RNA sequence: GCCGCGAUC
DNA sequence: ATGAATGTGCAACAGCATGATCGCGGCAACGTGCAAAAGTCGTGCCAGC
């Protein structure tokens, strides 16, 4: 984690929580199975504004 | 970063607190030595000491030796304690300890269905305590929550009845310790038992890789409507029969069931009953249970098969076949739509697996689950009746 | 002004400020004259840096 | 005479077939012997505390003319015995007193003294003692100390497997491992460069230290190489002839011998030419000039004309250089060997690598390399080199290290200084060069001749040495400023560092653990435990596959079976039955000397190194009557391998078939028929069975049960007993037979049995007597059998009528189906004693008195408390009932009017005091046993305390009165004899007390001598009784010096009976285990023809795959034994004649095939035959030794003797349907143990308990109401299923959502089942942690 | 060896966790030649086991030329495989996840029918975790 | 808030 | 024939090595004197019985 954080710190990047590992850490619904439909509805709302 | 308590009002300084307090201890003396017009050497040394202390606080074990506390062990810094193993293993990222969970030794229950697990009534009434409170308050037995608490501790009979009412169709999911593959955590329908150990269905032991020699399993309760549906439509034992690795049926009888099926479907050169002609599989059970014939005798039985060449329709054909009494008895449990050449063998731990696979492929899921339960029941019964024993 | 203090990091014991000058729920977000501890729900010890 | 009294009670039918030569040793000798040699006085300084004292003392100041001279030492008497020390909860130790004096030397007169103060002993330190079983009772515990198996100091050569640089170059390295000090290594480069890794610093040439040993460049070359001389006279340039040197070379020019051609240019190189040249005596001959070009000059010739000379050693020569040396007159030139056939170019290359050629330069170089700080000033480097090596104190090779150093280098002398000299480094460097050259071989690192064993005594000696060094450093400062008035205790004797170090070692160490207390077997196998870990050992992760392997020298010294399974396999061992340690610390094994072809009965003890030279025979080899082997070809072990050798080549003989195995694996019958891993599992599982309610002997054993039980200290063995006088349920007293007595005071031997007492694993320890009354008892006889022991026989299970058959899937996998007659007959019911403690300690606001009167508690909870405030003994308790009524004072000094009216309407305290009363923890039931109140001195004693002290006084006087009764009986007998001798009054004299006023005076001699002496004896005996009675009344009843904060303590014990139940684990002793699955009723178990239903039903499917043939053979053999027992029981039922019963027992005892069992009932009287027959009516307890026991034919004959089916299978009828099972079922009696893994202790269930401040997650583990951890793999499986809502609810609302938990609890109570999730606290903690660094993390909108 | 297999499973799961079937059919024509696995002279994997539960990227041609057997982009199952084995087919080109041609996921057709259920795989299944667990479930029994 | 030690699968 | 740039090879340093349970112990880092204020103690006060 020491290597990854610094290479992420200097670049100032973002996560965007696209995979399964990121959503498990945060505690939201994973984009798979039953939680996949919920993440499909949210994507349209973000794109539509 | 709270202090670790101990006997008396004394509060020991923790590892994180020591690393900080060293930094401020250096900082105050340095910021003092700035204004005293001290010689460059001493302030230089103090700057080096403060810089080293800050580095050790931020990551101990880098840029020189590692500072230690009372014991000759490194004082873990902010790096070593990010979450668990310097990463997010223990306290985050799938490492959360969960409540509404139990743990007890597992034994075997052969009377259980494919989707049932025996749950002790002492783990229940503790996993389902809030549900019991809700049902007690709903029926007016305890107007206040405190009364429900007190009567649950006193464990009256009506509390047991209400627990049985709550349990009725609330699936609960058991898992073993080294969850290797996705079949290592399955959801069963609990049946309360007057006992102290979880009763696991013998068929799912192959999937769990569990044998009853002190093995323990955890019992996690899905406590939400979405969670209950997920544990019923995605995790029920009757749902996942085919292993998601090769397509072969993971839930397949083994050990005593296979021995019983093998002993039932065998042929002896001479036994009680030779060349007898009997009406059907019904007479085979009557002759065997009466003692007039042996399980390994060879007879000719008039038997009916069902066939599925017709589109969605079953056609019945009747013929006279030469088989054994044991095979004729076994045929009574197979569903309609399977050719008789599937039980006219020895059924040695592979023919039975292919029997289940063909039943799944041709018939579906409900018939193959019922078939698996019947197969295990009859295999256990006839293996016990055989009296197979190993001697010197 | 130590590592664990009361002027910053919030209070220590519930909605009670130091010296007992203002220890109630009648006072919200007030600063005692004698001590700089602000009244809060003592769960802010997990947020102030 | 042949059999002892307890052996006459029940004779095990040994199957033998091989006579035993040496009986099993004390079986706990290592621990006791090590501590004895650690404590006992030694005239010399070999070992023990005396050796450490000689090593440190005497001490003196820096030219202060004051020295510390000491003589001897003594260990005081312990102030508590083992039992009281265990009960009270303090360390069993003794004071340490030492005799030492002060001497003051004259300052003006050299070597003269002016004062000599011979002060008395000064107390210093506490040394815990070892109990006679081998345990160190510290802090009220057992705390056994496991011996450590560590690398022996010496010289170790290794090859590093030849794969470091992947070039195929094998690299040889040497190590110098000392007992204490710095290390030293030699290392071979891929480029063949000598590197020395001193104290594991950077790699450094060996030439620097070689020069630092005051060796010049020419001298090192002369020592490390064979120099040759080239003579160039009159331009001939002759060459010396050494035929043995040149083996492989090319003749660059014609070689002529004395003017005659011997070898042509490029001629034959075979040994024939070399032999021909050697045979001809030829002087020096000329050689081509170009040949000498490749040579390197070793010495440095000096020109006689000018001081200029070619001193450049390790350099070649030039053509112009030849003219220069010819002009200078250098007729002879000295050059080294420069030959590379077996030797090679070394040393010189390293001298060319580094240019330091001075001792000072080498010293400063090594000082800078090791210490990168301040450069030295001709003193620091020299001092550092003196301290690093060849130092008396800082560095010290052990005696065993010196022995191994000398043996590895093949030196005749075995003794010497424990320090390494200059020649030693040279010798090891030479040996490394030789091993690189080809001569010699690398030694194995796992050889048991290289792995030393160290015990508790040596470790305690090392700790005491460290403490002694510290106190000596403290003392040295005193004499600098010490005056003559300063006494020894005033000179900082400073016992605190020594006691601190000793107690730190004994209490908190890697190799001093809680002793296992399930069965005597666990204690026995824990005391003699071999551990490779520890301070000087190796880390678990560090151990490779080589260490965890069974080296072929583990034959008779380390068990190959018994070892932990998962993490620690191969790192924890167990000593074999006959193994012991060397005088240096190496494991030996007995062997029998074989002279010619007959094996003698003389026994020689062979270490690991010695046994690799001889030829050792096999225990299972036949013999003749005189002693010769029955075959001319006999299997043997020569050097690690096994082959067949001639009868005349055999040199040594194995003592017995039990030699290889340990104690734990010796108690498995038919061990040879079991798989090795299954035997491992059975041996490990035997050490876990809980002692049941009633001891039950094994129907089939190995005869080693008696040795395990007797030497474990669990039983009570008659030390010198004769005929027992009075047997009690708690006491045994024996009147010793007159033939052997101690003259004066006579006396009897009294045993105080220990009743129900908690063990370390919460199990109960009980001792029940064997002898009834007036039974003669010989030396070594067992009187009281402890937990899991029957008549001195280790019995840790119960025999069960096991049938192997699948029963309707209830014995699926490894499940066990148990009958209900097992439950009814109270088998496997165990007692578990649990300890609950409470201490009354003062606080800021006052004292914490304890009383029954507890405010705010109803009369229901006060029903079971006395006037003092603790539960009555024997009250059955459960749930959470109050145990001790303890109040904690609260602070209040402002009596507000509300408090005033509260005190007015209620009591004076008005319930101000709190109630910190200890309650029964959840899940704990059972009747109380004892209460252990103790009181601080000065304070008023508890009301019940007086009853404890009165009970102690009652038992004390009752125990002392018997010897007084006997002594006054003897005195009365003597007085009666004297009065009968003269003036006898017959019964009149006996009627009047005091011998009827001492029978007046009678004769003058009797009055002056007889009566006066009798009166004097009576008076002094009465006074002696009174003084010791008073002293023992005084010391028992004394105010205990509690902890300063502690005022008064109370402890409560509970006793719970655990009946067998489905979840409880049961296992055999052949590696078969399992959990019960159902307690079936009696009427459902299968029954034979006679109607006896089986007790346990097992699964046959577990035998053929695990290869546990011991199960089947044991069941058959137990069935035969129980058939014999049933025959004897039926015979006793008809009360037939003694002759017929004796004949049957005789015909059943001598059955076998050339068994070494010569018991016979002819020399057995009538009454002991009936006692034996009534003792073995349950079953004839036969014993088959480990590797040579009952065969199939013998078992079949035993079965046929009892009128049973020979094949070992019976027709079993079903209990439910009553239909005969088609195949016969193998029915037999197997010994089933109940392990210590009970479900009552393995169930947990949490809904909402207590969380942690950080991460806000639920706690973990039982006894804390924790929750099962949803691991990473579980979440992966959840993701694989596609179940996302379950994952979300298991990640947020169950663990870390502070508001989510409460919201969802409210929703469930309402009945909503709504998610309403949130944001875990763990991620917020992680964000705060990262923000605490220099990295900023925030959540974007 | 259990530790070294668990570490491998950890790495595989971490690599493959971000993989979910998010599309129905990418329409790509790419495929992989699937011939029965042969070693020396012994038949060691028949084509039936390798091609069962996959989609045909191109129509399989019987030895008789210009004779279609199965339509393009169809799922092979027990009936199709039994019909295919009756003839003398040797090579079948089938679509696989390596050529899914979709972005951030894998088409439901390019990945064949799931092995847990008879029907084709539905959208949203986390195939990467299943694949990693399936690969790492053995390994605690591989002989090393 | 751990560290050692032992044990189970 | 010789110098410089480049590519190759070798040595030192960093991360990492399964999961879930149960049971016992042991266990760290002042001073200073005066203003300035505040609290306290011996003492005298009025109000209730
Ligand atoms: Mg198991
Ligand atoms: Zn305040
Ligand atoms: Zn695709």
- What DSSP letter does each residue of chain A carry, written as one string? -HHHHHHHHHHT---TT-SHHHHHHHTS--SSTHHHHHHHHHHHHHHH-
DSSP-based three-state secondary structure for E124: coil
CA atoms of B305 and B323, how far apart (whole Å): 14
Cα dist from D1209 to D276, D772, D1122, whole Å: 84, 41, 14
Q: Where are the alpha helices (DSSP H) in D1134-1219?
A: 1138-1149, 1166-1175, 1192-1201
CA atoms of D458 and D38, how far apart (whole Å): 7
- C-alpha angle B357-B363-B365 in degrees, rounded to nearest 5: 75
* Torsion angle (degrees, nearest 10) of CA D325, D327, D331, D336: 0
Q: Kindly report the backbone phi and psi dihedral angles of residue D915, in degrees, each rounded to the nearest multiple of 5, phi listed first.
A: -130, 90
CA atoms of E51 and E69, how far apart (whole Å): 15
D1282/A28 touch (CB, cutoff 8 Å), yes or no: no
**D-contacting residues in E 68-127 (Cβ below 8 Å):** 124-126
Q: What's the CA C36/C1' G37 distance, rounded, in angstroms?
A: 19
Cα C29 to averaged position of ligand 2 atoms, centre (Å): 12
CA atoms of B101 and B104, how far apart (whole Å): 11
Beta pairing, strands D757-758 & D764-765: antiparallel
Closest residue in D to A14 (Cα) is D1340
Chain D residues with CB-CB distance to B102 below 8 A = 1243-1246, 1268
For the record, the structure tokens of D265 come out as 């240019």
CA atoms of D266 and B62, how far apart (whole Å): 64
DSSP 8-state symbol, D1008: I
Cβ neighbours, 10 Å, residue B38: 14
List the one residue out of E113, E92, E83, E88 whose CA is nearest residue E21.
E113
For the record, the structure tokens of C49 come out as 């840096």
For the record, the structure tokens of E106 come out as 């894998």
- Check if the beta carbon of residue D562 is closer than 8 Å to that of residue D665: yes
DSSP-based three-state secondary structure for D987: helix
CA distance D212 to chain E (A): 49
Q: Does any strand F atom come closer than 7 Å to the Cβ of B4?
A: yes
What's the half-sphere exposure (Cβ side, CA atoms, 13 Å) at D100? Answer: 21
CA atoms of E71 and D163, how far apart (whole Å): 58
CA atoms of D725 and D748, how far apart (whole Å): 9
CA atoms of D296 and D545, how far apart (whole Å): 47
Cβ neighbours, 10 Å, residue D901: 11
CA atoms of D802 and B342, how far apart (whole Å): 38
Cβ neighbours, 10 Å, residue D876: 12
Cα B107 to averaged position of ligand 1 atoms, centre (Å): 11
B vs E: CB pairs below 8 A: 33
Residue B18 among known ligand-binding residues: no
Cα dist from D265 to B57, D243, D248, D254, D255, whole Å: 77, 17, 14, 4, 7
Beta pairing, strands D723-727 & D716-717: unpaired
List the one residue out of D557, D524, D528 whose CA is nearest residue D147.
D528
CA atoms of D408 and D421, how far apart (whole Å): 16
Cα D1024 to averaged position of ligand 3 atoms, centre (Å): 105
List the one residue out of D710, D553, D929, D1007 whose CA is nearest residue D27.
D710
B91 → closest Cβ in D1244, D1314, D1322: D1322
Q: Is the dihedral of CA E126, E127, E128, E133 positive or negative?
A: positive
Residues found in chain D: 1341
Q: What's the CA C32/C1' G36 distance, rounded, in angstroms?
A: 21
- Check if the beta carbon of residue D357 is closer than 8 Å to that of residue D245: no
The protein residue nearest nucleotide F4, judged by CA to C1', is D510
- Check if the beta carbon of residue B215 is closer than 8 Å to that of residue B183: no
Name subunits touching E (3+ CB pairs < 8 A).
Answer: A, B, D
Closest residue in B to E126 (Cα) is B182
DSSP 8-state symbol, B218: E
Q: What's the CA C3/C1' G30 distance, rounded, in angstroms?
A: 19
CA atoms of D975 and D1226, how far apart (whole Å): 73
Query: What's chain D's Rg over C-alpha atoms?
Result: 41
Q: What's the CA D931/C1' G22 distance, rounded, in angstroms?
A: 28
CA distance C27 to chain D (A): 24
* Torsion angle (degrees, nearest 10) of CA E18, E23, E29, E34: 60
Closest nt to residue D511, judged CA to C1': F5
A19 → closest Cβ in E17, E22, E123: E17
Method used to solve the structure = cryo-EM
DSSP-based three-state secondary structure for B40: helix
Query: Looking at the CA of E28, which ligand is closest?
Result: 3
Cβ neighbours, 10 Å, residue B55: 14
Chain A residues with CB-CB distance to B86 below 8 A = 1-2
- The residues pairing with B189 across neighbouring beta strands, listed in sequence order, are B116
Closest nt to residue D814, judged CA to C1': F9
Beta pairing, strands B274-278 & B298-307: parallel
For the record, the structure tokens of D937 come out as 């001195």
A20/E18 touch (CB, cutoff 8 Å), yes or no: yes
Q: Which residues of E are annotated as a binding site for Zn(2+)?
A: 26, 100, 107, 110
Closest residue in C to D1328 (Cα) is C47
- Check if the beta carbon of residue B182 is closer than 8 Å to that of residue B244: yes
- Check if the beta carbon of residue D175 is closer than 8 Å to that of residue D432: no
E17/A18 touch (CB, cutoff 8 Å), yes or no: no
By the CB < 8 Å criterion, does E17 face chain D? yes
DSSP letter string over B281-336?
Answer: HHHHHHHHHTTSS-TT-EEEEEEEEEE--STT--EEEEEEEEEEHHHHHHHTTSPT
Name subunits touching A (3+ CB pairs < 8 A).
Answer: B, D, E
Are there at least 3 beta-carbon pairs closer than 8 Å between B and C? yes
Chain C residues with CB-CB distance to B21 below 8 A = 3
To test the contact with chain D by mutation, choose from E4, E125, E129 the residue with the greatest count of D C-beta atoms within 10 A, namely: E129
Closest residue in B to C1 (Cα) is B24
E125/D1277 touch (CB, cutoff 8 Å), yes or no: no
- Check if the beta carbon of residue D116 is closer than 8 Å to that of residue D102: yes
In angstroms, what is the resolution? 3.8
Q: Kindly report the backbone phi and psi dihedral angles of residue D575, in degrees, each rounded to the nearest multiple of 5, phi listed first.
A: -65, 140
C47/D1332 touch (CB, cutoff 8 Å), yes or no: no
Measured CB to CB, residues of chain D less than 8 Å from chain E are 1272, 1276-1277, 1279-1280, 1282
To test the contact with chain A by mutation, choose from E15, E18, E106, E114 the residue with the greatest count of A C-beta atoms within 10 A, namely: E18
> What's the maximum distance between 2 C-alpha atoms anywhere in chain C?
29
Give the DSSP H or E segment for D830.
strand D830-841
Cα dist from B279 to B302, B319, D318, E128, whole Å: 6, 11, 116, 55
- ω into D83 cis (within 30 of 0): no
CA atoms of B284 and B325, how far apart (whole Å): 6
- Check if the beta carbon of residue D311 is closer than 8 Å to that of residue D221: no
Q: Is D826 left (phi over 0), alpha (psi -120 to 50) or beta?
A: left
Query: Token pair 């990418």 is at which residue?
Result: E26
CA atoms of D57 and D818, how far apart (whole Å): 68
Chain G positions with any atom < 7 A from a protein CB: 10-12, 14-29
Residues 6+ apart with CB under 8 A from B126: B102, D1245, D1246, D1247
CA atoms of D850 and D887, how far apart (whole Å): 6
Query: What's chain A's Rg over C-alpha atoms?
Result: 14
Beta pairing, strands D798-804 & D1096-1098: parallel
Q: Which residues of E are annotated as a binding site?
A: 26, 100, 107, 110
Q: Where are the alpha helices (DSSP H) in D336-486?
A: 348-353, 359-370, 380-388, 399-408, 422-437, 456-476
CA atoms of D1055 and D1060, how far apart (whole Å): 16
By the CB < 8 Å criterion, does D1300 face chain A? no
Query: Token pair 């190993």 is at which residue?
Result: B390
Q: What's the CA D300/C1' G20 distance, rounded, in angstroms?
A: 75
Chain mean position to CA D1246: 39
Cα E104 to averaged position of ligand 3 atoms, centre (Å): 10
Q: Does any strand F atom come closer than 7 Å to the Cβ of B211?
A: yes
CA atoms of D1039 and A41, how far apart (whole Å): 79
List the one residue out of D871, D691, D663, D661 whose CA is nearest residue D789.
D691
Question: Where does residue D573 rank: exposed (0-12), middle (13-18), buried (19+ CB within 10 A)?
Answer: buried
- Strand F contacts (CB < 7 A) among D residues 648-707? 681, 684-685, 688
By the CB < 8 Å criterion, does A17 face chain D? no
CA atoms of C49 and B20, how far apart (whole Å): 13
Chain mean position to CA D1039: 38
For the record, the structure tokens of D1012 come out as 């006066």
Cβ neighbours, 10 Å, residue D165: 11
Residues 6+ apart with CB under 8 A from D932: D87, D1049, D1050, D1051, D1052, D1053
Q: Where are the alpha helices (DSSP H) in E17-90?
A: 47-51, 78-86
Chain D residues with CB-CB distance to C47 below 8 A = 1328
- Check if the beta carbon of residue D416 is closer than 8 Å to that of residue D402: yes
Closest residue in E to D1276 (Cα) is E129
By the CB < 8 Å criterion, does B223 face chain D? yes
CA atoms of B70 and D701, how far apart (whole Å): 53
Q: Which are the residues after which chain B is interrupted (C to N > 2.5 Å)?
A: none
To test the contact with chain E by mutation, choose from A30, A32, A33, A38 the residue with the greatest count of E C-beta atoms within 10 A, namely: A32
What's the half-sphere exposure (Cβ side, CA atoms, 13 Å) at B362? Answer: 21
List the one residue out of B187, B207, B218 whose CA is nearest residue B123.
B218
CA atoms of D942 and D868, how far apart (whole Å): 7
Query: Token pair 């260490």 is at which residue?
Result: D547
Q: What's the CA B74/C1' F3 distance, rounded, in angstroms?
A: 12
């Amino acid at each position: 984690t020491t290597r990854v954080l610094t290479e992420a710190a200097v670049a100032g990047k973002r996560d965007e929580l696209r995979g399964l590992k990121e959503n498990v850490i945060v505690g939201r619904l994973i984009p798979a199975g039953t939680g996949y439909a919920y993440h499909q509805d949210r994507m349209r709302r973000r794109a539509a504004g | 970063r709270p202090l670790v308590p101990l006997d008396g009002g004394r509060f020991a300084t923790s590892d994180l607190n020591d690393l900080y307090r060293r930094v401020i201890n250096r900082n105050n003396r340095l910021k003092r030595l700035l204004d005293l017009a001290a010689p460059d050497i001493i302030v230089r040394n103090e700057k080096r000491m403060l810089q080293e202390a800050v580095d050790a606080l931020l990551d101990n074990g880098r840029r020189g030796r590692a500072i230690t506390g009372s014991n000759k062990r490194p004082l873990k810094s902010l790096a070593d304690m990010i979450k668990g193993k310097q990463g997010r293993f223990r306290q985050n990222l799938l490492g959360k300890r969960v409540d509404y969970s139990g743990r007890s030794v597992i034994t075997v229950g052969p009377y259980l269905r494919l989707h049932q697990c025996g749950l002790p009534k002492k783990m229940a009434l503790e996993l389902f305590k809030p549900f019991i409170y809700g049902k007690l308050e709903l029926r007016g037995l305890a107007t206040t929550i405190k009364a429900a608490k007190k009567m649950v501790e006193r464990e009256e009979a009506v509390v047991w009845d209400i627990l049985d009412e709550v349990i009725r169709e609330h699936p609960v999911l058991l898992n073993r310790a080294p969850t290797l593959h996705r079949l290592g955590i399955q959801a069963f329908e609990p049946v309360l038992i007057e006992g102290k150990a979880i009763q696991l269905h013998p068929l799912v032991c192959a999937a769990y890789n569990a044998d009853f020699d002190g093995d323990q399993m955890a019992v996690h309760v899905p406590l939400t409507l979405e969670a209950q549906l997920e544990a019923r439509a995605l995790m029920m034992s009757t749902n996942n029969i085919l292993s998601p690795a090769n397509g072969e049926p993971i839930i397949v009888p083994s050990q005593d069931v296979v021995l019983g099926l093998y002993y039932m479907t065998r042929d002896c050169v001479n036994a009680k009953g030779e060349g007898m002609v009997l009406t059907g599989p019904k007479e085979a059970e009557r002759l065997y249970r009466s003692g007039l014939a042996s399980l390994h005798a060879r007879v000719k039985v008039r038997i009916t098969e069902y066939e599925k060449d017709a589109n969605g329709e079953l056609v019945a054909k009747t013929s006279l076949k030469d088989t054994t009494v044991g095979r004729a008895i076994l045929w009574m449990i197979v569903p309609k739509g399977l050719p008789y050449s599937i039980v006219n063998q020895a059924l040695g731990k592979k023919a039975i697996s292919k029997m289940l696979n063909t039943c799944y492929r041709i018939l579906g899921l409900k018939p193959t689950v019922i078939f698996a339960d019947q197969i295990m029941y009859t295999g256990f019964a006839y293996a016990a009746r055989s009296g197979a024993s190993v001697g010197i | 002004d130590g590592l664990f203090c009361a002027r910053i990091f919030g209070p220590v014991k519930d909605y009670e400020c130091l010296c007992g000058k203002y220890k109630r729920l009648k006072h919200r977000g007030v600063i005692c004259e004698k001590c700089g501890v602000e009244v809060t729900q003592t769960k802010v010890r997990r947020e102030r840096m | 005479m042949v059999y002892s009294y307890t052996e006459k009670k029940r004779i095990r039918k040994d199957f033998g077939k091989r006579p035993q030569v040496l009986d099993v040793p004390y079986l706990l000798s290592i621990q006791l012997d090590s501590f004895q040699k650690f404590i006992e006085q030694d005239p010399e300084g070999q070992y023990g505390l005396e050796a450490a004292f000689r090593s440190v003392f005497p001490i003196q100041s820096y030219s202060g003319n004051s020295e510390l001279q000491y003589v001897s030492y003594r260990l005081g008497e312990p102030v508590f015995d083992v039992q009281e020390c265990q009960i009270r909860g303090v360390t069993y130790s003794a004071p340490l007193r030492v005799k030492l004096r002060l001497v003051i030397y004259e300052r003006e007169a050299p070597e003269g003294t002016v004062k000599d103060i011979k002060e008395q002993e000064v107390y210093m330190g506490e040394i815990p003692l070892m109990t006679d079983n081998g345990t160190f009772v510290i802090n009220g515990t057992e705390r056994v100390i496991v011996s450590q198996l560590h690398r022996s100091p010496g010289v170790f050569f290794d090859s590093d497997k030849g794969k470091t640089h992947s070039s195929g170059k094998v690299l040889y390295n040497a190590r110098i491992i000392p007992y204490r000090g710095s290390w030293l290594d030699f290392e071979f480069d891929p480029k063949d460069n000598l590197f020395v890794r001193i104290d594991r610093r950077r790699k450094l040439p060996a030439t620097i230290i070689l020069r630092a040993l005051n060796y010049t460049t020419e001298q090192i070359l002369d020592l490390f190489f064979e120099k040759v001389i080239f003579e160039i006279r009159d331009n001939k340039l002759q060459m010396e002839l050494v035929p043995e040197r040149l083996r492989g070379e090319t003749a660059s020019f014609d070689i002529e011998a004395n003017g005659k051609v011997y070898v042509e240019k490029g001629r034959r190189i075979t040994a024939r030419h070399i032999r021909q040249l050697e045979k001809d005596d030829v002087k020096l001959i000329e050689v081509p000039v170009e040949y000498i070009a490749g040579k390197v000059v070793a010495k440095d010739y000096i020109d006689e004309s000018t001081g200029e000379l070619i001193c450049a050693a390790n350099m070649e020569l030039s053509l112009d250089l030849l003219a220069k040396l010819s002009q200078s007159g250098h007729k002879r030139i000295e050059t080294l060997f420069t030959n590379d056939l077996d030797h090679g170019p070394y040393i010189s290359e390293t001298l060319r690598v580094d240019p330091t050629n001075d001792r000072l330069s080498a010293l400063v170089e090594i000082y800078r390399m090791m210490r990168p700080g301040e450069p030295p000033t001709r003193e620091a480097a020299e001092s550092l080199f003196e301290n690093l090596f060849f130092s008396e104190d800082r560095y010290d090779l052990s005696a065993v290290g010196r022995m191994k150093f000398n043996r590895s280098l093949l030196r005749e002398e075995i003794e010497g200084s424990g320090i390494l000299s200059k020649d030693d480094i040279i010798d090891v460097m030479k040996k490394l060069i030789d091993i690189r050259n080809g001569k010699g071989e690398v030694d194995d690192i796992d050889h048991l001749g290289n792995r030393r064993i160290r015990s508790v005594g040596e470790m305690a000696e090392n700790q005491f040495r460290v403490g002694l060094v510290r106190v000596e450093r403290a003392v040295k400062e005193r004499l600098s400023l010490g005056d003559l008035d300063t006494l020894m205790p005033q000179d900082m004797i400073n016992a605190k560092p020594i006691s601190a170090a000793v107690k730190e070692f004994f209490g908190s160490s890697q190799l001093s653990q809680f002793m296992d207390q399930n069965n005597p077997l666990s204690e026995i196998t824990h005391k003699r435990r071999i551990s490779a870990l520890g301070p000087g050992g190796l880390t678990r992760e560090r151990a490779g596959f080589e260490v965890r392997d069974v080296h072929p020298t583990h034959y008779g010294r380390v068990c190959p079976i018994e070892t932990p399974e998962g993490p620690n396999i191969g790192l924890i061992n167990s000593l074999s039955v006959y193994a012991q340690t060397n005088e240096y610390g190496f494991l030996e094994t007995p062997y029998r000397k074989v002279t010619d072809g007959v094996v003698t009965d003389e026994i020689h003890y062979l270490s690991a190194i010695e046994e690799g030279n001889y030829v050792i025979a096999q225990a299972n080899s036949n013999l003749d009557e005189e002693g010769h082997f029955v075959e001319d070809l006999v299997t043997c072990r020569s050097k690690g391998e096994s082959s067949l050798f001639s009868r005349d080549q055999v040199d040594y003989m194995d003592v017995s078939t039990q030699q290889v195995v340990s104690v734990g694996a010796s108690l498995i019958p038919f061990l040879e028929h079991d798989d090795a891993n299954r035997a491992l599992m059975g041996a490990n599982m035997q050490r876990q069975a809980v002692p049941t309610l009633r001891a039950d002997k094994p129907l089939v054993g190995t005869g080693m049960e008696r040795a395990v039980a007797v030497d474990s200290g669990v039983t009570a063995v008659a030390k010198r007993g004769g005929v027992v006088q009075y047997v009690d349920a708690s006491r045994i007293v024996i009147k010793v037979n007159e033939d052997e007595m101690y003259p004066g005071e006579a006396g009897i031997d009294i045993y105080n049995l220990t009743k129900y007492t908690r063990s370390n694993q919460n199990t109960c320890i009980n001792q029940m007597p064997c002898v009834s009354l007036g039974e003669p008892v010989e030396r070594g006889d067992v009187l009281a059998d402890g937990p899991s022991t029957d008549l001195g026989e280790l019995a840790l299970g119960q025999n069960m009528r096991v049938a192997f058959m699948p029963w309707n899937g209830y014995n699926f996998e490894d499940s066990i189906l148990v009958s209900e007659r097992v439950v009814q007959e109270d088998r496997f019911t165990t007692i578990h004693i649990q300890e609950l403690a409470c201490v009354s300690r003062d606080t800021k606001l006052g004292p914490e008195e304890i009383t029954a009167d507890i405010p705010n508690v109803g009369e229901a909870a006060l029903s079971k408390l006395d006037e003092s405030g603790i539960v009555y003994i024997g009250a059955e308790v459960t749930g959470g009932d109050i145990l001790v009524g303890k109040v904690t004072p609260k602070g209040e000094t402002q009596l507000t009017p509300e408090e005033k009216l509260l005190r007015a309407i209620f009591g004076e305290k008005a319930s101000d005091v709190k109630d910190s009363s200890l309650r029964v923890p959840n899940g704990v039931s059972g009747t109380v046993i004892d209460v252990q109140v103790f009181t601080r001195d000065g304070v008023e004693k508890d009301k019940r305390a007086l009853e404890i002290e009165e009970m102690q006084l009652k038992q004390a006087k009752k125990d002392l009165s018997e010897e007084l009764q006997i002594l006054e009986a003897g005195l009365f007998s003597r007085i009666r004899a004297v009065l009968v001798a003269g003036g006898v009054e017959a019964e009149k004299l006996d009627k009047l007390p005091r011998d009827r006023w001492l029978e007046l005076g009678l004769t003058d001699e009797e009055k002056q001598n007889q009566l006066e002496q009798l009166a004097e004896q009576y008076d002094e005996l009465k006074h002696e009784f009174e003084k010791k009675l008073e002293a023992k009344r005084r010391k028992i009843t004394q105010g205990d010096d509690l902890a300063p904060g502690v005022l008064k303590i109370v402890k409560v014990y509970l006793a719970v009976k655990r009946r067998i139940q489905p979840g409880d684990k049961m296992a055999g002793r052949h590696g078969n285990k399992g959990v019960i699955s159902k307690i079936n009723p009696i009427e459902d178990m299968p029954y034979d023809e006679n109607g006896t239903p089986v007790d346990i039903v097992l699964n046959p499917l577990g035998v053929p795959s695990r290869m546990n043939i011991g199960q089947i053979l044991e069941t058959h053999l137990g069935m035969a034994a129980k058939g014999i027992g049933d025959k004897i029981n039926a015979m006793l039922k008809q009360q037939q004649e003694v002759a017929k019963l004796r004949e049957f027992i005789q015909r059943a005892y001598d059955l076998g095939a050339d068994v070494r069992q010569k018991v016979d009932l002819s020399t057995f009287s009538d009454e002991e035959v009936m006692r034996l027959a009534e003792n073995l009516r349950k079953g004839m307890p036969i014993a088959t030794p480990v590797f040579d026991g009952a065969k199939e034919a013998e078992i079949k004959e035993l079965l046929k003797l009892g009128d049973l089916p020979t094949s070992g299978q019976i027709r079993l009828y079903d209990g439910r349907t009553g239909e005969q099972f088609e195949r016969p079922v193998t029915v037999g009696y197997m010994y089933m143990l109940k392990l210590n893994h009970l479900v009552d202790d393995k169930m947990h269930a949490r809904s909402t308990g207590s969380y942690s401040l950080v991460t806000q997650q639920p706690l973990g583990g039982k006894a804390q109401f924790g929750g099962q951890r949803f691991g990473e793999m579980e979440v992966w499986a959840l993701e694989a299923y596609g179940a996302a809502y379950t994952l979300q609810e298991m990640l947020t609302v169950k663990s870390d959502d502070v508001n989510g938990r409460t919201k969802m609890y409210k929703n469930i109570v309402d009945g909503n089942h709504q998610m309403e999730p949130g944001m875990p606290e763990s991620f917020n903690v992680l964000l705060k942690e990262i923000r605490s660094l220099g990295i900023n993390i925030e959540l974007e909108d | 060896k259990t530790a070294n297999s668990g570490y491998l499973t950890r790495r595989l799961v971490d690599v493959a966790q971000d993989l979910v079937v998010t599309e129905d059919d990418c329409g790509t024509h790419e495929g992989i030649m699937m011939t029965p696995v042969i070693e020396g002279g012994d038949v060691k994997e028949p084509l039936r086991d390798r091609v069962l539960g996959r989609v045909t990227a191109e129509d399989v041609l019987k030895p008789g030329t210009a004779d279609i057997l199965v339509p393009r982009n169809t799922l092979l199952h027990e009936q199709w495989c039994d019909l295919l084995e009756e003839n003398s087919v040797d090579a079948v080109k089938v679509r696989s996840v390596v050529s899914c041609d979709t972005d951030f996921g894998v088409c439901a057709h390019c990945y064949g029918r799931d092995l847990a259920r008879g029907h084709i795989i539905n959208k949203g299944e986390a195939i990467g975790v299943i694949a990693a667990q399936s690969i790492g479930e053995p390994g605690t029994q591989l002989t090393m």
